Amino acid sequence: EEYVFESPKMKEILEKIKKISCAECPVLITGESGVGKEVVARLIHKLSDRSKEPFVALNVASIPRDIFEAELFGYEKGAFTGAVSSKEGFFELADGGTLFLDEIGELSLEAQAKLLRVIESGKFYRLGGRKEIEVNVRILAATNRNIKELVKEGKFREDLYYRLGVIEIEIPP
Amino acid sequence: EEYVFESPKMKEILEKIKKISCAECPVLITGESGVGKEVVARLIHKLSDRSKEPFVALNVASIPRDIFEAELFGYEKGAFTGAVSSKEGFFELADGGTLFLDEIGELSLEAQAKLLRVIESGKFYRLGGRKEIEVNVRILAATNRNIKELVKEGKFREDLYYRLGVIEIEIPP
Amino acid sequence: EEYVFESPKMKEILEKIKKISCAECPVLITGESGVGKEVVARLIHKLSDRSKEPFVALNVASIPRDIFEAELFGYEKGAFTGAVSSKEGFFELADGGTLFLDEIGELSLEAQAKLLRVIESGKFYRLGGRKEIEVNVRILAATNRNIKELVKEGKFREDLYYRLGVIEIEIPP
Amino acid sequence: EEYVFESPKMKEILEKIKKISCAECPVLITGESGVGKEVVARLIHKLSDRSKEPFVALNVASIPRDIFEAELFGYEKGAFTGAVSSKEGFFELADGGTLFLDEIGELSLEAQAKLLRVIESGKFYRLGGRKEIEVNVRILAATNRNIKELVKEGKFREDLYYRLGVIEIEIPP
Amino acid sequence: EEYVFESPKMKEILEKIKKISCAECPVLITGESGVGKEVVARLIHKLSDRSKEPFVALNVASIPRDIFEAELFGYEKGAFTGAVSSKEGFFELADGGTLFLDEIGELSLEAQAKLLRVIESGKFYRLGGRKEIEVNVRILAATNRNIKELVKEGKFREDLYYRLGVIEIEIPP
Amino acid sequence: EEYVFESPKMKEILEKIKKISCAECPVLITGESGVGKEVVARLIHKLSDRSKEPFVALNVASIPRDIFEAELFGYEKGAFTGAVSSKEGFFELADGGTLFLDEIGELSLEAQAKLLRVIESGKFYRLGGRKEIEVNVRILAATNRNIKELVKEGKFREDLYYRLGVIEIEIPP
Amino acid sequence: EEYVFESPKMKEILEKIKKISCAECPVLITGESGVGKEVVARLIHKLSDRSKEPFVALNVASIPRDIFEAELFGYEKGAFTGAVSSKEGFFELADGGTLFLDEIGELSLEAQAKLLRVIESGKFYRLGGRKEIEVNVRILAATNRNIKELVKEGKFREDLYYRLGVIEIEIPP
Amino acid sequence: ERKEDIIPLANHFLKKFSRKYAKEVEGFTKSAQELLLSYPWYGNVRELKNVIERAVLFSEGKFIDRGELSCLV
Amino acid sequence: ERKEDIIPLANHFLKKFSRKYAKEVEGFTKSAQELLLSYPWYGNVRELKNVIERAVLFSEGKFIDRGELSCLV
Amino acid sequence: ERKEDIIPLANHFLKKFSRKYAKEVEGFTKSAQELLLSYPWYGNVRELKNVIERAVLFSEGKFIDRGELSCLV
Amino acid sequence: ERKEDIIPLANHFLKKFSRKYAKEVEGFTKSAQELLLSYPWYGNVRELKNVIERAVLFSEGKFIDRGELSCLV
Amino acid sequence: ERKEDIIPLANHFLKKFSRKYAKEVEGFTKSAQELLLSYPWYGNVRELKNVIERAVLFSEGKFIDRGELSCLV
Amino acid sequence: ERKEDIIPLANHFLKKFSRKYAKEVEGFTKSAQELLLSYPWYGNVRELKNVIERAVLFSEGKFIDRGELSCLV
Amino acid sequence: ERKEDIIPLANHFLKKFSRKYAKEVEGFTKSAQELLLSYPWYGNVRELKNVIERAVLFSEGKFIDRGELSCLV
Ligand SMILES: Nc1ncnc2c1ncn2[C@@H]1O[C@H](COP(=O)(O)OP(=O)(O)O)[C@@H](O)[C@H]1O
Ligand SMILES: Nc1ncnc2c1ncn2[C@@H]1O[C@H](COP(=O)(O)OP(=O)(O)O)[C@@H](O)[C@H]1O
Ligand SMILES: Nc1ncnc2c1ncn2[C@@H]1O[C@H](COP(=O)(O)OP(=O)(O)O)[C@@H](O)[C@H]1O
Numbered sequence A, B, C, D, E, F, G: 001e002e003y004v005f006e007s008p009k010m011k012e013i014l015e016k017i018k019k020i021s022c023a024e025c026p027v028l029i030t031g032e033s034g035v036g037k038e039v040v041a042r043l044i045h046k047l048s049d050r051s052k053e054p055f056v057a058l059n060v061a062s063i064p065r066d067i068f069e070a071e072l073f074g075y076e077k078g079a080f081t082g083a084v085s086s087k088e089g090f091f092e093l094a095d096g097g098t099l100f101l102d103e104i105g106e107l108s109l110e111a112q113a114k115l116l117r118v119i120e121s122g123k124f125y126r127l128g129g130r131k132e133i134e135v136n137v138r139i140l141a142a143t144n145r146n147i148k149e150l151v152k153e154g155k156f157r158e159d160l161y162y163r164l165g166v167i168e169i170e171i172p173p
Numbered sequence H, I, J, K, L, M, N: 001e002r003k004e005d006i007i008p009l010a011n012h013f014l015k016k017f018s019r020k021y022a023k024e025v026e027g028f029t030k031s032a033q034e035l036l037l038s039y040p041w042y043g044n045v046r047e048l049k050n051v052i053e054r055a056v057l058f059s060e061g062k063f064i065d066r067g068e069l070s071c072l073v
């Protein structure tokens, strides 16, 4: 059988997804919990040119704020007591495919920045030093909070907003 | 001699354990204090395929909520003042065997998430950065509180519920 | 000259101490204030195999309930605003020797648990993360309150009782 | 010109101060309000070996009983909502010099204990965890109430009395 | 069409930029967020002799303080667990062109120093060892904080101030 | 015109410099920040026999502790991921001339040792292997901390102290 | 005049040295810092048959663990970026004489092995390839740590212990 | 709101697991199929996935009916 | 404060993307051009860059008017 | 509720410890065995484990009876 | 209840401190020794430890009697 | 504390740079020379080195006075 | 576990070295032979090889007993 | 603990250096010799080696006394 989309506003949103097909600009999805955000990311990617490519979805809340900037990107050896190898990255694992960051508002100012830098340059370095890796990952942010607000609270970098705010989809409860 | 099971509902629960034998899906055990939860986990594991493998039982209450997300998983060096080596993990110690988390309700939202991520992916990273370790641990949660309730209180992640709620055993007082 | 023991019940208790000599199981001492509890701990240890080893006596009342679980064990860096180094521990200072916890009843449920875990496993972690230290410390609890009672009040973990209740000495006023 | 001492009992007390010179044992000063207690502390210290060293006088009444055990000693980060840095201490500021605790009777049982521990060990920890700082501070307690009494009222730890009661000066109205 | 400068103080600042043309001494730009700092750097460089040369702008906040001293400069192999090649540098990428360090105040004391050394010598080494690379990069620092202040706070090296303080432009809100 | 020395203690220190002229034994300079230490080194060398020879001043703080032992001395190829050539050295660049190590206390125990070995033998090897280079460099250490103290803290090798402590100049604030 | 030995245990140790005279088996010296270890090596060698022969003392701590296996032995050309000539060796410089390795415990497992091979065979090769040099050097290890312990920690090769443990001298503090 | 999915999905699952745990379980009985269709499935597809892995393991014969299911649903 | 820029810029962009995603989009309609000029453009040039890449992709025919734009602006 | 366990278990323990602390303790006397069976053992197996490590240490001869036990039970 | 301890202990202490504060104090006089034995010593050994550190410091000559002691005891 | 140095040094610098950036700048005017002597020069010789490289570049004619200097000092 | 080897081996060694360092050492005394047999010899044959080269050198007369040995074993 | 060494050693050194830096320094004066003997010499022979190379260089006439020494010792 199939999936489920039939209400006007969604009859719509599906198409918006379909059009966005041939694209790679990041996408910002927003709706209350349960509305289908992460279901749209997944669909956007099933529809993007890189459907067959991996889907690296990671809940930004499912990781202590102090280790996100260690697992998203990666880690350069001996910089934090105990390192079995410079740590790879979800960015690197998502290289060539999609990287669905769920619950964006929960990004530390430090990573909010560090992401921005990788959304524009596409290059990143694991900790102190310089970039030595090439990643081609389409950003897909989804959050249930109101981004704009957070911007006047200073909890959310504005320039990072507009950067992910290329394509913006809003799922109605 | 032997152990003790003779009442119908338990004459039962033993079997449910026996059947579950050949499995690895997490299990959610619930009963009032003293009912035999932790006695069932132990029995489930004595019966699972990995009986000879370790049993890493850890009371989630027997550790200050701020250091659980440092000992369950592990810790990447220099991220918290003073680190003699990136900290191993009960997850890593329980690798290949069972990890009986007692009193689940007492999990911080941050770890409730972090566990979920490891129940599905099976990979984890110590703090910020990325996963660089491979753990094969069967989750065994036991709590004396009513999970569902906690879900409407927002103190307990729902998706983490259904994930551990694969097999659910309820010990009657 | 010498010390003082001459009444029957104490003429006794001294011996009980002497026998316990060759042991390491925790000991639970109980008597009204001033009866000589802390004098017995000290004697038990002067008599244990580890007499020459340190004696780390710490009044559980001589430290605000919120910092006990920070000084008994130790502390993993940056987990509480301001950390000059991951904090050592009285457990670690008492490693190889005795750890006389005075006025046990005054242990927070959180530490009552955290102690239990270290009385059985002998391993502990400073805050969130995992154990990375090896401590061999003989527990010596002394309290002037009636433990059992506290157990029906829920202020005192029972399993922690029986664990320290291996050897139990009661000093009569 | 000079200061003022001419009555026999004070012609005396001055000398007692002079003798005590070469010492560091705590000192307990007691006299009605205004009698010159805090004037003697100051003189004791002008005369001690550490005159050139700081004088950290702090009225134990000039701070809400719930924040004394946060400012005398210090504070380990994130243990109380809002911590800009683990809080230093008057003990630490008084390190190497004198710490004149005025109006001792006004010490909470919790700190009365916590002080004792630092009068003997000289080591202290900011909240839960362990000691990681070295302080060399000479205790100088002054109170206008009758200590002994308070001991039968249970408002004042006895062992803390005798500890500060090494040298005791009593200023007559 | 064109860009935008018409107010006196800016009608000015543009010229200051124009004059500075034929120069290479570092430049220190300061103004509240949004005032046009990074717009001036960019213009200074469009006007410098090396306009056609690269512009390596890097937000000093867009990188965890522990990996800046790994990406700005570069990295000598096997010095931190995991190194695919001694890491190049933004300094090396900016060689021959401009290096616009945004938000300078956010430089670790360690790099604040390490930069100074490269502003004077122009030579640098990736980690421990010695310089083996030749970089000709014009420094362009921009910060929104008040440098001077930071100097009395000890958070900002003074000598590094005067070094970048060769040419100083201040953008009024 | 000239430079500035006129106070007795400095009217002095200048001469001490003048006498030391005909020497090469290392020199240890110590004074608060700004007192003129690095101004004396420079003068000592302007006066030594090797004035016309180079002056290789290097701030030991202006380089991450992990790359100092890579740039002071030098580096033997392929020992750290990425090596364009076995790295030369400030020691080698300072060969025949002075090597003013500023802020000595900031030397890692590993280099504190490695320096000592070169102050006595005068030969050094870049990483693992053996010495194959001949360097004639006069050591000139300057630090603002109190060396002796650091020796009881174990942060500073004693034998390295006395070795640099041949000639010792102390600049008064 | 003379040197200093007069206490019984040392009145002794001197003789043990004297007897050992006519020998060449390695010697293991152990005592707390400062006890006179390196003073005994030196004396052992002044007394061995090869007194007139060189004394190549090298602190194993005075060289970064990654360059010891490059300077002790030697180095075969182009194996590490930058090699002016295959590097000689302290072993080769100590050929015909004594090689006093101070602070043995600080030997990497890799060299601990590589030494063993040269204590038995007496032949060694600089890096990958084969032995082409003949060295006759008497090993003299001195360490302040307890070797045996290190053996259960796995930080110290046992067979290398017994090999150096031919003659063992222990200097009492 | 896709009762036309429960019975097909369920049947998918019962197949996955019956093969995953080597259980001779062929499928659900009518009595069982009914229940599955009446349950509200708050967890939806997920909950049914679990409910059946669980029912496949608990399975004793070749089929599943009110028996094992009621244990849950 | 450069309404004389919105319509030219926009037109720049609409060209970039129309060529980047191979879309037969020639330009904005009057109705649309108005809107673009009225929007406050807080993001300024940046926001317009996005608003139009987005409008180029969402585009169906040869032109863009109140339609796709209102979706955003 | 397993009085048929107390005497065997106890005997297990008395063996463990008698060997752990090198004590010439062979076993319990009748008088003692009775007591052990009458005690309610709230702690159950655990409490008996302790009660006997303790009784093994307190032991003076080769056996244990009302003597050492009463001290506790 | 160990008056046979007061005079020996006291004498211990007087030695410790006399050496700790470099005081030419040799010991207590009879008159003093009496007092020390009569005092009830609630603090016991502790209180005597203090009473004498204090008396050692307050000491002026080579001995201690009713003088310095009465100040306290 | 060497006001006798400011004007000579400054003049050194003004020469260095005037030649380094090929600027027809000959020297400071009285009005300017005053200022330079009054400034406290915390940076001292260093700060003056910068203040003037900067003033040499900012220079428009053949001389420097209150004009360019005030911009800084 | 070859105490029947210690005394023969040892004797081998004592011969090797006595000849290697030109020492008039003929052999071990009873008292010594005992010790050698009681030592656990973790190093085994190796450790005994060393223990005796060492004892041969330390040797003063014609024999070896508790004396030199105790120094080690 | 070899005060009988300080004056001879010192004298050794004073000779080495006096010859190494071509200084007409013959030796220490009484006043100086005293000091050298009182100093604790933590560094011992080493520290004296330095203290005197340093004193030889600082030397102005033919002898060394409290003067140059006090500078250090
Ligand atoms: N439009 C839809 N059609 C069918 N199923 C949906 C739809 N939207 C959501 N779901 C279902 O609801 C659940 C909630 O999904 P999800 O989108 O991940 O939540 P959130 O929007 O908070 O990220 C999913 O398991 C999915 O199967
Ligand atoms: N069914 C049972 N048969 C025999 N003993 C049991 C049984 N259930 C519990 N126990 C005993 O009761 C105690 C309580 O065990 P536990 O299951 O760990 O508590 P909880 O259920 O709260 O985790 C155990 O020490 C165990 O020996
Ligand atoms: N049996 C005893 N013999 C001699 N002195 C004793 C005896 N019991 C207690 N004391 C003394 O009494 C004081 C009270 O001691 P303590 O045991 O620490 O109190 P508590 O029992 O409340 O911990 C001690 O200073 C000690 O010298």
Ligand SMILES: Nc1ncnc2c1ncn2[C@@H]1O[C@H](COP(=O)(O)OP(=O)(O)O)[C@@H](O)[C@H]1O
Residues within 6 Å of the ligand: D003, D004, D005, D031, D032, D033, D034, D035, D036, D037, D038, D039, D040
């Ligand atoms: N013996 C004295 N000689 C001169 N001034 C005194 C003397 N005693 C007290 N004072 C004065 O009286 C005031 C009360 O002082 P203080 O000792 O601090 O009060 P209290 O004894 O209650 O702490 C002081 O300001 C001080 O100048």
Ligand SMILES: Nc1ncnc2c1ncn2[C@@H]1O[C@H](COP(=O)(O)OP(=O)(O)O)[C@@H](O)[C@H]1O
Residues within 6 Å of the ligand: E003, E004, E005, E031, E032, E033, E034, E035, E036, E037, E038, E039, E040, I045
């Ligand atoms: N003088 C100006 N004329 C035209 N646009 C400007 C001017 N100043 C700033 N802007 C615009 O404002 C935005 C903010 O720019 P920026 O200078 O980078 O911020 P900041 O000063 O905090 O670094 C830029 O995108 C730029 O297009």
Ligand SMILES: Nc1ncnc2c1ncn2[C@@H]1O[C@H](COP(=O)(O)OP(=O)(O)O)[C@@H](O)[C@H]1O
Residues within 6 Å of the ligand: F003, F004, F005, F031, F032, F033, F034, F035, F036, F037, F038, F039, F040, L045
């Ligand atoms: N005695 C002096 N005479 C003239 N200038 C001095 C003197 N001492 C220091 N300075 C000046 O002060 C500044 C601080 O110099 P420096 O010696 O390098 O600091 P530090 O002593 O901390 O290394 C220098 O730029 C120098 O010109």
Ligand SMILES: Nc1ncnc2c1ncn2[C@@H]1O[C@H](COP(=O)(O)OP(=O)(O)O)[C@@H](O)[C@H]1O
Residues within 6 Å of the ligand: G003, G004, G005, G031, G032, G033, G034, G035, G036, G037, G038, G039, G040, N045
């Ligand atoms: N027995 C001794 N007699 C005379 N001097 C000694 C003796 N032992 C040590 N020393 C002195 O003490 C110093 C410490 O020497 P050393 O043996 O090298 O330290 P360590 O034992 O840690 O290697 C030496 O400079 C030496 O002159």
Ligand SMILES: Nc1ncnc2c1ncn2[C@@H]1O[C@H](COP(=O)(O)OP(=O)(O)O)[C@@H](O)[C@H]1O
Residues within 6 Å of the ligand: A038, A039, H009, H012, H045, H046, H049
């Ligand atoms: N339509 C479906 N057909 C078969 N299996 C499904 C279907 N939808 C979900 N599942 C299964 O149920 C689980 C729910 O998955 P998911 O897509 O993540 O739900 P959600 O809508 O919340 O994102 C998956 O593990 C998958 O195997």
Ligand SMILES: Nc1ncnc2c1ncn2[C@@H]1O[C@H](COP(=O)(O)OP(=O)(O)O)[C@@H](O)[C@H]1O
Residues within 6 Å of the ligand: E038, E039, I009, I012, I045, I046, I049
């Ligand atoms: N004047 C312009 N004409 C055409 N495109 C522009 C113009 N200004 C900015 N852009 C585009 O808008 C984006 C804003 O760029 P930027 O210059 O970084 O802004 P800011 O003023 O904040 O520094 C750029 O990616 C660029 O392609």
Ligand SMILES: Nc1ncnc2c1ncn2[C@@H]1O[C@H](COP(=O)(O)OP(=O)(O)O)[C@@H](O)[C@H]1O
Residues within 6 Å of the ligand: B038, B039, J009, J012, J045, J046, J049
């Ligand atoms: N049936 C038994 N036979 C022998 N020893 C036992 C038995 N049951 C428990 N024990 C011992 O008693 C203690 C109680 O253990 P445990 O199994 O954890 O109890 P619980 O039922 O509460 O989980 C254990 O340390 C174990 O050594």
Ligand SMILES: Nc1ncnc2c1ncn2[C@@H]1O[C@H](COP(=O)(O)OP(=O)(O)O)[C@@H](O)[C@H]1O
Residues within 6 Å of the ligand: C038, C039, K009, K012, K045, K046, K049
């Ligand atoms: N028997 C004794 N002989 C000598 N000094 C003692 C004796 N008993 C106690 N002291 C001293 O008196 C003080 C009381 O010590 P403590 O043993 O802690 O008393 P308590 O009985 O209360 O535990 C100690 O600091 C110790 O130095």
Ligand SMILES: Nc1ncnc2c1ncn2[C@@H]1O[C@H](COP(=O)(O)OP(=O)(O)O)[C@@H](O)[C@H]1O
Residues within 6 Å of the ligand: F038, F039, L009, L012, L045, L046, L049
């Ligand atoms: N006396 C001087 N005459 C001319 N130029 C000087 C003089 N002193 C310093 N400078 C210049 O000022 C800068 C300050 O240099 P420096 O000697 O390093 O100062 P510091 O006293 O801090 O060591 C140098 O780059 C130099 O070119």
